Each structure stands twice: as C-alpha cells, then as structure tokens.
Amino acid sequence: DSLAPEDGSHRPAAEPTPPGAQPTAPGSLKAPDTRNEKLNSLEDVRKGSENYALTTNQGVRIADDQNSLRAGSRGPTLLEDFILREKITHFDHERIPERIVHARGSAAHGYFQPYKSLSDITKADFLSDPNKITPVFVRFSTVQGGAGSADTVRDIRGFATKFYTEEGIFDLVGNNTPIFFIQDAHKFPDFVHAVKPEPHWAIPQGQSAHDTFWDYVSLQPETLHNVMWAMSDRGIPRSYRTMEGFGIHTFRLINAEGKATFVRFHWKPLAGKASLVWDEAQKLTGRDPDFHRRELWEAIEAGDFPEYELGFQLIPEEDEFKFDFDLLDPTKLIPEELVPVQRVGKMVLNRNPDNFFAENEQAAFQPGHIVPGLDFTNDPLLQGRLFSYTDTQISRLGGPNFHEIPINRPTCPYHNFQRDGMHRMGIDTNPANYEPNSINDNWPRETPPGPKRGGFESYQERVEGNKVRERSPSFGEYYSHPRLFWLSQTPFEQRHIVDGFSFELSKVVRPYIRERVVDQLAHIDLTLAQAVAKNLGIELTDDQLNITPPPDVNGLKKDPSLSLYAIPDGDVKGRVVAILLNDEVRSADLLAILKALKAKGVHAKLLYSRMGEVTADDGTVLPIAATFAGAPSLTVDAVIVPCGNIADIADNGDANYYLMEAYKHLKPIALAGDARKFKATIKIADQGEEGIVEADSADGSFMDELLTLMAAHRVWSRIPKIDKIPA
Amino acid sequence: DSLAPEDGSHRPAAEPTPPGAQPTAPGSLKAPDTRNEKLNSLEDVRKGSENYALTTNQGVRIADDQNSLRAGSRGPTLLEDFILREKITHFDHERIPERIVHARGSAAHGYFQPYKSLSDITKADFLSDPNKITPVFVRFSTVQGGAGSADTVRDIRGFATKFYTEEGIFDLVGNNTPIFFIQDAHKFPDFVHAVKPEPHWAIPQGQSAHDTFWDYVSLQPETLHNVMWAMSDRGIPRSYRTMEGFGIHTFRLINAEGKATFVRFHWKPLAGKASLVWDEAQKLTGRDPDFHRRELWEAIEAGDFPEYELGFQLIPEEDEFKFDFDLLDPTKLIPEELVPVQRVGKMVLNRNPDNFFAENEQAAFQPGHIVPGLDFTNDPLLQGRLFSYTDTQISRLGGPNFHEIPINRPTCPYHNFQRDGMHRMGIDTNPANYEPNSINDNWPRETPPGPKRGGFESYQERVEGNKVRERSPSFGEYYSHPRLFWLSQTPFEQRHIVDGFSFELSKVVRPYIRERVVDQLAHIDLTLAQAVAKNLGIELTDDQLNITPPPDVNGLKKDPSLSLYAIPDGDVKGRVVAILLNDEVRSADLLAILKALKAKGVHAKLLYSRMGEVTADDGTVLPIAATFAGAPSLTVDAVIVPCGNIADIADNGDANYYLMEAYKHLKPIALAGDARKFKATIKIADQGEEGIVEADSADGSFMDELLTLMAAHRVWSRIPKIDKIPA
Ligand code: HEM
Numbered sequence A, B: 001d002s003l004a005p006e007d008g009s010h011r012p013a014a015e016p017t018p019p020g021a022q023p024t025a026p027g028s029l030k031a032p033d034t035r036n037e038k039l040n041s042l043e044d045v046r047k048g049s050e051n052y053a054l055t056t057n058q059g060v061r062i063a064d065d066q067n068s069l070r071a072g073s074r075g076p077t078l079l080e081d082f083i084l085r086e087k088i089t090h091f092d093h094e095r096i097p098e099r100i101v102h103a104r105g106s107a108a109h110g111y112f113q114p115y116k117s118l119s120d121i122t123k124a125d126f127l128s129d130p131n132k133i134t135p136v137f138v139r140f141s142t143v144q145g146g147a148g149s150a151d152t153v154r155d156i157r158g159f160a161t162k163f164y165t166e167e168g169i170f171d172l173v174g175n176n177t178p179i180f181f182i183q184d185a186h187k188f189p190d191f192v193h194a195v196k197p198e199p200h201w202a203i204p205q206g207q208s209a210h211d212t213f214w215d216y217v218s219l220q221p222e223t224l225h226n227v228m229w230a231m232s233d234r235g236i237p238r239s240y241r242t243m244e245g246f247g248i249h250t251f252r253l254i255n256a257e258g259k260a261t262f263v264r265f266h267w268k269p270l271a272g273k274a275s276l277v278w279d280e281a282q283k284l285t286g287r288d289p290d291f292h293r294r295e296l297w298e299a300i301e302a303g304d305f306p307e308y309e310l311g312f313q314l315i316p317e318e319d320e321f322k323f324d325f326d327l328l329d330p331t332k333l334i335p336e337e338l339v340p341v342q343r344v345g346k347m348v349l350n351r352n353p354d355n356f357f358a359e360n361e362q363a364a365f366q367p368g369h370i371v372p373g374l375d376f377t378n379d380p381l382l383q384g385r386l387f388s389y390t391d392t393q394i395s396r397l398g399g400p401n402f403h404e405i406p407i408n409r410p411t412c413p414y415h416n417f418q419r420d421g422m423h424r425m426g427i428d429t430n431p432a433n434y435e436p437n438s439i440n441d442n443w444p445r446e447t448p449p450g451p452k453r454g455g456f457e458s459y460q461e462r463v464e465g466n467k468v469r470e471r472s473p474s475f476g477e478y479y480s481h482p483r484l485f486w487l488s489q490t491p492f493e494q495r496h497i498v499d500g501f502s503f504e505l506s507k508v509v510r511p512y513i514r515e516r517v518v519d520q521l522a523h524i525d526l527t528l529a530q531a532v533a534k535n536l537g538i539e540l541t542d543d544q545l546n547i548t549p550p551p552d553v554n555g556l557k558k559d560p561s562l563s564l565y566a567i568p569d570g571d572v573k574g575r576v577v578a579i580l581l582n583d584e585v586r587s588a589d590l591l592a593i594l595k596a597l598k599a600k601g602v603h604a605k606l607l608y609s610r611m612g613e614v615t616a617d618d619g620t621v622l623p624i625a626a627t628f629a630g631a632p633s634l635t636v637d638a639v640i641v642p643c644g645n646i647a648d649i650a651d652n653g654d655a656n657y658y659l660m661e662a663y664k665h666l667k668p669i670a671l672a673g674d675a676r677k678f679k680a681t682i683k684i685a686d687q688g689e690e691g692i693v694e695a696d697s698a699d700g701s702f703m704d705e706l707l708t709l710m711a712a713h714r715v716w717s718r719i720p721k722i723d724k725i726p727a
C-alpha cells in the first residue's frame, strides 16, 4: 500500500552518524561511496528491491502474498499452491550448521596497506609496495558459545582476517591472546569438549565456569598460560576495537633469495587496549547480549573505523634454539622485551556487510590459506589445523565449492582442472579436465617459483627422526610463562585475575577439582595461589607453601607489554557517555558538555525516565535516546549529570542506581551544580574524590577533567571503596 | 593414570538429591531404575564406557591419545596418522543445522495415562484405557533465539509432546499461549523474519524489542492478541513446570461410530502458574542463561517431576458457528467461561536424557503426526504446518530416515514399501518393494478403518467453494480477544503488560512505528493505550480518545482463567530458598528453617561470602553452595537470613544487595534475630510490612508465615514501594 511515513523518517541518512541517531542499515545503503576491489566485485550478486515486483524464485509475479490457496475461503489448503510451497520450503531450509568453534562472531569489510616494501624478508605480493592496497574481510568472535550466545562472556576472542591478494587469498586466523591452551592438535577435541557445554544436559553456554573445563585444566598444566590470560580482564574486552590480535604460531617469511625468517604476527589496536570488569561483563550478557556486534557495526556507521597495525616479531633461523622455551610451542609467547614487534602496515575496517548470513555466516577462513612468500613451521598445533578447516567446510557450507560463495571468492584469477561438486557455479570451457594434456596445449599451466608471480614451493626444511607419536621434551615446561604473565600485571589486574579464578572455581561442583587447580596455581606463584585458596576457603599445605617458583623467562621478571594498562594507550574517540536528563536542563551545561565531547569524537546518549522529549530551560527541545533502565550504565564509558531541575530525578530509583552501577564498575562520573546532590547516593566525600568530576557548572575545566579520566578508561583507585556499595 | 579422587566424590549418588547437592549426570546413571517402554527400547543403542579400552570408531585400540604421528618429535605431522584424522574429522562434522524456529529447548522423558476411557468421543488407542500407559518425550523451548541463546527472555514458549502409542506416534506440538500471532501459514516466514534478528546485522538475539517486529505488528492487527500475551508476565515464565500449554488449533476427535467432535488441547501445570518480573528475567539472561534448562533437569533429579493434566475443550459439530469468532481462527481463544476444559489424563516427566545432542537436539516433532481417532480441521495456519515439519527435517536431520534416529523411533511396529535414502538403518527382507504385489502375497497389507487397530481414514468433511487465495471474512476481527485478555488480568498484571510494551517500544528506533502501535492499542482499550503513550512521551489525539472499544466476546467482560494469578494455584514443592550464612550461625534457627522447608519439599541453598565451609554455634560444619555474587537472588524464590554473628555480613555489599534485589523483585524475605538489622537496607517500616517475615528467632510461626508467602509466589502489594529503591 503505503507504508512509509510521508516524512521519510523510515530511512537512515547515507552519511556517518553517531550511535543511536538513526536506524542502522546494510553497508551498501548506509555508505554507498565506500568501495574497494572486493566490495566492487560483490556487485554482481547484490540484489536491490525498491520498485521491483514481488515474485517466486522462478520470476513469476505474486498477486496475493497474504493467503494460501484453498477450496472455499474456509476450506482446506490445496497441494497445487506452488507459491506457498516454494516460500515455506525456502524458509524451512534457511539454517546451515554453525561453526564448530567460534560460532559467535561479527564481521566487517576494510582494506590493508603496508608502510614500506618488505621485499628483503618476504616475496609476499601484498607486502611488496606501500601503494598496493589489499581488500580485507575480518571476523571477530568468541570461542565456546553458539551463534546465538552472548558477546561479553569471559572467553578467548577470535580475530580472523581474509586478505584478497593479487597472488591468492591469505587468511590470517588468530586470537586475542598470544598463546593457545594446548600443544598438539590431536587434543583439540578433548580441550574443546571440556570447555563446551557438558554433554548430558548441554550447560553451560558461553562459559568455562564448570567442572569439565577445570578438570581438564587441572590434569593438563600446558593449559595454564592461556588460562591466566582468560582469567585476566583480557577475557572480557570492551570492544573488538580495543583488544590485541596474534597469529600465535611461529610461521616463516620466505624472500626471493629463498631465505627463511621465523615470524609471529601481531595486530595492535589503534583505539588502545581496554576491558570491562567481570560484574559489568556478566550483567551486560543479559542487558544486551549483542553488545560487541552492535558497537562494532555502529562504530563503522559513525566513522570510528576500527584500525589495527600489523606487526612482526622476527627471528633469524640461527636463533631458533636460543630461548628458554621452544619457538614451535604454541603455549609459549615471545616476550616483546626480547624480540620487539616491528610495525608492518595498517588495516582499516570501514564498511559493514549487506546481509549477515550471506557474507558473515558463510565466510570461510583457513590458516592453511597462505601465498608464496609465507610458509609453515612444525608447530604441532598448527600442523593439525591445516587438516581441519577444509574438512569442516565441506559439511558446514555444503560441498567443495565454498570458494565460489561470493564473500569467499578470490579477486585474482583462479584456473585448474577441478570439476563438479555440489552447487558448482563456474562453467568450465576447457576441453581438458586433466594435466598433462595436449588437447588444450596443457593450459592452465604450472608456474616455476620466482621473485614475483611464481608458483608456490615449500621451503626445503630438513626433516630427521623416526615416525613417532611423541611430545617434544622441549615443550615440557608449563609454569614460567604463566608466572611471567602474572608478574607483569598491575596490582588491580592481579586482583581481577584472582577474582576470575575464584568466581570460576566457585562454580565447579566437585571440590577436589578446585583443590587440584589451586595446587597448580601454587606452582606458578604463591601470592596468587593463596589469594584464590582464601576465596575458596581452602588452606595450602606446608609443601604447597614450599614449591619453588619456576625460573624467569630468559632473565625477565616482567614485561609491561603483557599488561592491558601498565603503559597508557587510551583513546577516547568512539567512546560514549550517558547524560542523565531532567525536565528543565540548564542548556548552558548541555552545550558545554556536548561540544567538548564532539571535539574529541566522544558520543553521547540523552537518557530520561520516559521516551519522547523534554524541554531545556531556554526552550531547546531535547529528544530522548532511551530510558535509564533501557540503556544501562553497562553500555557506556562514563556518566554526566547536568544541572537543571534535579528534584525531578533526585528520587528516581533507576536514576540513582544508574550512578551506583557506573560507580561500582569504576567509570568516571561528572556532576554539575545541583547534580552534586547525587554524591550522597554514591557516599562520596564532601571534599570530593579522584574519579568524580564536580563543579558549580559544566564549564571550563569540568569537561577537560572528565575527558582525562576517560582517557585512562577506569578509576582503578576506587576499587577498595566499591566493596561496601550494595549494587 | 588417573583418577578419580580415592573418596569417590567425583560420582553423584544414584538417588534423588536436591538442586546443587551433587553434580548432575546422564539420566540412566542418575536414575537407573526409572523405566518405561521407550526408555527400555533405547537400551540397544546406549553405550557405556567404564572398563573399556579407548578405540577408533573401527574398534582399533589407541595406545597414545595425546600426540599426532610425526617424523621426529619436533617434526611435521604425517598424513598416515589415521587415528588423528578420524578423531579431528568426527569433531569437524559435529554440528547439524539448528531448528529454524524453537532452536533453544530443553527436554525430558516421562509417561502419560488417561483418567478414564474416552471411547465415547474418540477411538484413539492411547486414550482408550486408564491403565494403558504411554511413554512420552517432551521438549520445551523458546521461539526466536538460537540453540545457544538464553532461557529467560521475553518470548512465546513451545511445549511439544511425543506420545509413543500402540497405534503410532502422536505429536502434540503446542505453545504456552492459547493463540498464535498470525492466521495463515503463508505469512509464517514474514512474521518469523520480522521477530528474528534483523538481516543486515543479525541483531537482536532472543528479543522482539526491535523495529522490524513492531513494524510488522503495527501493520498486521491480527497479531495483537498473541502480542498481549507476550507482553504480559506469560512471556517470562518462572519455569517450564509453571506455565500452561495449548495445541492452539481446533482439531477433531473421531469415535468408533464416525462422529466428529471439535477439540482444543490444554495442559495444566500441577506445580501452578508462575512467572518472573521483567527486570529479574532480563538480568537472569546474563547471570544464568541456562536457568530454565538447569531448573528442569534438577527438578527431575530431585524427584520434583513436572506434572501436567491434559484437558480438552469439546465443541459439538453443530456448534461450529455459534461463537462471535471463528473456531478455525488461531488468533482467537475459546474462553473457559464458555467451553470449560474437561480433565483427560496426567503426564509425568521423571527422567532426563543421557546425551543432549542425541535425544534432545535430534528429536523431531510434527503436528501432522496424528493417529486413528484424531483428525485435522481447515484452520489455515494448521493446514500449512502440515507441509513444513517433514520438509524442514530432511535437511536438519539429513535425509528421509529421521524416524530411524533412536529418540524418534516408534515403539509399535512399522512396515511399508519405502526404501533407501541417506543413512538407511533398516534392512528390508521383503522380496517386494511395491504394492500390489503377488511375490510377497501382498504383505505388508492395508487395514480397513474400524473401532480399534484399524487403518487411518479421514473424516469425510464436506468441501464447497472455489479455488481462492482469500482470508475468511469471519477472521477479520482483531481487538475483542486482546481486550478480553486485558480486562481479565489483575491490576499488577495490567501494569506489567503496560511496562512490557513500554520497554519494547522504547527500543524501536523509528518513532512513527511506536506511534502506529500506540494507535492499535487505542482500538483495544484506552487505559492501556494512554499508560503506554505516557511512558513513550506520546499524546493521544482526540480521535484516538474516541475510538469505540470492541464488543465483549459472547457477552464476557472477563474470564479469570486468562490471568496467571487471580485464582490462587500456588505450589511450593520444588521451589528454592537462599539462606545467607554468617560465620557463627545460630544452629537452632537453621534447624527450624530446614525442617520446615523439608516438610513442604522446598529446597535451600547455603550462601556465603566465600566457598568452603563455616561452623555454626554448635560446631556443625556447613558446606557452602555458592557465594552471594555467584548465585544471585534472581535464582531463588525467597530469602532467609538466620541469626548468628550478623556483624560478619552486615557491611558486606553483596549481602545487602542480595536483599535489595530480592526485595525489588517482590520475593518473600525472612529475617531472624539480629538479621532484622538488614531492615534498614531495604528501608522498610520499624513496625514491619506484609511480605517481610521477622521475629526474635526462626521458630514456630516464622516458617509458616514464610511458606504462606511462598505459596502466593510474589508480594504484589510491594509494587508501589520498589520504584524508589535504587537496585
Ligand atoms: C592457535 C590456535 C588456534 C587459533 C588462533 C584458532 C582460531 C580460530 C578462529 C579465529 C576461528 C573462526 C574463523 C571465523 O571467524 O570463521 C576458528 C575456527 C575453527 N577452528 Fe581454529 N584456532 C586454533 C586452533 C584450532 C585447532 C587445533 C583446530 C583443529 C585441529 C581448529 C579447528 C577449527 C575449526 C574446525 C574451526 C571452524 C572453521 C569453519 O567452520 O570455517 N582450530 N579458529
């Protein structure tokens, strides 16, 4: 009929807008001018809608899409209704298997560019010229939960990048911690079954806090290093934009002269490192289970494009055996104090998908998708990964032609003698389907390895030894990396780690499992083990108290790059502030606040006890984004309460609780004029306290002080005072 | 090695135990003596584990399950490692598509028995004899969310029962509200797409609070009736045990003389009707997303078997057109004040599955699976559901032999000429695979219809009309049932409905959609429409204030059976109380508390600020179930605080917040002796208050007062006092 409002407010503007201002939309409608080579080549399968008639899949126009065909208007539905049958049949077959791990993830389009040619160390074409732009598709994810599970759970995060190079797709499939839990791929199903929901009753979702995980951990001390990262605030990032990414494994770079250099891949977040606190994270899984997916999408619609710097840890072939740990051991990190990360290039994510299922759900990444100029190593966890991804994609994506699903397609040429398979789109005209052949003059043809555009040839590593099912003895050390990680954390980080283990072990029903984990912690560090044991009402024995700590890692007693917060790297752009309105806001405060926020690229959400609008003291009509209950403090980075008629919200339960929740979760709070009445809610001294901005009006230094607090992310000095707060 | 602790504390006892006392376990280990015919037939495919060697799927014993085979202990993995490849391959192919709708669900085994022979109204064999037991498998579910989404979301709940009868499987596939949102199956994909996560970004999960849903509802007023149920507290049940179930459609009962009687199916919860409150429910999705799944499984492990009474609404064929609504319109309920529910039988769920995936995830139910003695009607929603479930099961469960998956197998005989298909288990020996045949003497053979054990023959309904895609005119009335439902609710239920709509519409980004829904509410009831409008800062126009309310439904101005609470039906057995311990618990309080809870079958959970144990005044060692933060008040039905050393917990933030949360969520709280000092936390009268139990000790009348409050579920009279509490 007539459905759209005549004012056109059903359609968001095709320009960058702040989170919550307009309805979000498919990338190609929201930002039609953001292009790259991959986004342009997807154009052939994009479908429009406006001005077209509604049809069946065979192109037959539909006259009545409200009713089934029946014998009389109160009669039985007829089998001849082919329109009903196609529509319900397509619906009936919508779902495909979710990924076995990392089923929950959010993705975006972008591009990569190197800072300079890396020709001296790799012949990889995407890294050979600073002007050569590589389109990318990135998917961020959790590990354990299903596709419908929550975003802000405590878990490891996946960070997978598909590089559409001129010499093939290269997938860099990494996580947000520099190590993995296990050493050999043969134990992957064991580890994953232990962390996933328990088999009898399929509980719990999105959580390692259960008996089978901690049972496996207590029996397999190789897991301890990644367990420490997961128990830290690393396991609950603030956003996919404020976390690090790592390839984990040592791989090789191969240059045109055939020299191999060992490399570990890193992604540095240009928005800085930032995490939530447990209580906030857990509650956020209920108030907004789509928080990371939403935040990513809206940051891109706002122009706060996630930006990451690609970095390399490089190690010469001759230094393979010079560390205290094996470089091929994926439970071991390479300390940046020993081997610095050399900056390589920048990746910018600047457009969302059009259809989540078609581009995100069907996207397929594989660590075995390498290009000439890169090569593998014998890391036994990576070695097993090379089998698994192609295998899993035959069932998940329905056959061996998953490279022909649009998002997965190479933008460079691909020709070979592979034919058929379910859902074959490519129609081959080659008279031959084999080589060598004479009937097509042997095309397509093999190509010798060489400096550029040559064929792939493996680096000729020497192999020597017997066929054995055996762990390398060099991998047999499990506590020095966990201890290095612990000692590099700030004191408040250490407390968060203690609390993570305490919370998680308190959900393990069999007490002996909690005792065995505590015994393993006692081999890492006694201060950690005692504080966890005390929260579990466990007392360490005299021999646990005398376990000798593991040695330092190559002499290091700490490495500050392992901490999220020890070295300041805060960036306020793309953060958000809740502004608690009243029914007669002092407009001078609001202008000061909103303009200061705008100058640093910080967003605001105007909150009230109802929707609609309120009128400021000078007649300005203020549109309300959400209620106090509808957009909790959990969703924002800070809270500002301007002056006005404070008696309007002074006794609102939700308004007060908003401040108590943001105060408990260490966020900066700013109170202007009579808004300082709320200081009694959060029991704050008369004289003031660090972390609380207060003044007669929201004017000169007020906003600079609030922005400085925001730059430091959270008010860690408040931790000892929040334990009293009933919130 | 390895082992299990020497004390055997890794294994749960095989007898009924209370929630949280022991680790949960597969049903055939937890309750080995619980049997039924279905449970016994599944024993052919059950696998043990104890005392068996670890093998490949081909039966080859494995010597080293910790390592891949490599050329040297630090070398590359070899392709000949068939043990590793089978192991990772099985793992890679674990997942199958989730259900298009109702993907999130929890199931259990049990049995059904009729109260008396229904042979006068139906020839259905499972209802023919009060001593004939029919094994059942029941799956309860949400609608919108994925299999990894949360349990206590606001949504409709599915309630599917598989009856393993002697004359075939009957599946009664119902929901927890007596109507559906739409009238014709042709709109199903339209409605489901609108409620599901939005296609560009796949948000939000498990929620109807978003623009597409409310856009659809505002344009399709036939949805309003189920929308009203969804926005009430019926959308957030306390448990699958405390909700109703309904077949929704009008079906038919066919007796041995060929008479048809119209029937609507009902399930009455013998644990009573009870729901959560929104804040509690939404927070619970984050604190425990598996709450309903967990509480069902634990109720069965505790002997609190979910029990339901099957009930029929019976309408003679001559009364088909005597209501003011069409009987075949699934957006219309049949008020119990006009056609009472006649008791039919009882269903008891007394055993959990062994393996969630094998039995719950692969279970397939179909409303098309009826048996002689039942038949369909021309309800156009039902009619299209007869096509869809078999269709969807061919891809979900991989082929046409889904009836051979163990959970789905009939326990009565099945023989026919169908052959082959993917994963065919049955091996047919019949020389013939067609009929009529002479080579097998025509077996298996057709069987004429008759009074018992006869072939199926459809009731010969008269059909007359033209081939039309047309909605019956009698279905074009959309507001009288929504209004009957509203007027039947108590004042607090009405407020909860107002708040549900207000919260949901507040998340609708496009304001004109909110305005359009408000306009539809004004056609239902003006008080409802204005209270929602006010929460959205919308003002009804003069025209909207003059819309005439729809007429009463056949003279009814209300029907108390439509309310959750107007008619008391409380049952405390299976409910749970939190007991907040201190380090010197007055043991006489605890004894009195525990004995009285035990006498009514109410469970307790001992909470403390840490795990481990505390010792009571009398030296009794009390093991701690969880901490205050680890098992929030959200998860219990009431809170008791016994006397002792109150100073230990008086300034504990979590302990104070525990009571504030419980108080806000209207739960009964009981305070003994010095625990009455917590009356200041919840700001309430020095003199006492209805809903708060208090005394010098936890003595005689203290526990009776607590248990009386619990039997009324929630303290509805405290609603006016909770909106000041900051919690
Ligand atoms: C350093 C260790 C590992 C890392 C960093 C890692 C990372 C990831 C990531 C980020 C994804 C999701 C990709 C996406 O968004 O689609 C993924 C998926 C997957 N991983 Fe790995 N993984 C590791 C180890 C393993 C191992 C040892 C195996 C098995 C041998 C494995 C098997 C899989 C499978 C089967 C999938 C699903 C792929 C699909 O369906 O396309 N992973 N992994």
Ligand code: HEM
Pocket (backbone or CB within 6 Å): A088, A092, B098, B099, B100, B101, B102, B105, B139, B140, B141, B157, B158, B159, B160, B173, B174, B175, B179, B180, B184, B185, B188, B247, B248, B249, B330, B363, B364, B365, B381, B382, B384, B385, B388, B389, B392, B393, B396
């Ligand atoms: C009164 C209306 C309806 C009710 C009470 C209802 C109820 C249910 C329930 C309870 C389930 C889940 C069964 C389980 O636990 O496995 C289900 C699944 C399903 N429903 Fe319905 N439904 C209704 C309408 C429809 C309609 C109109 C269609 C399509 C025309 C439909 C298509 C499906 C499909 C495809 C599934 C998944 C089945 C499977 O994968 O095995 N439903 N429905």
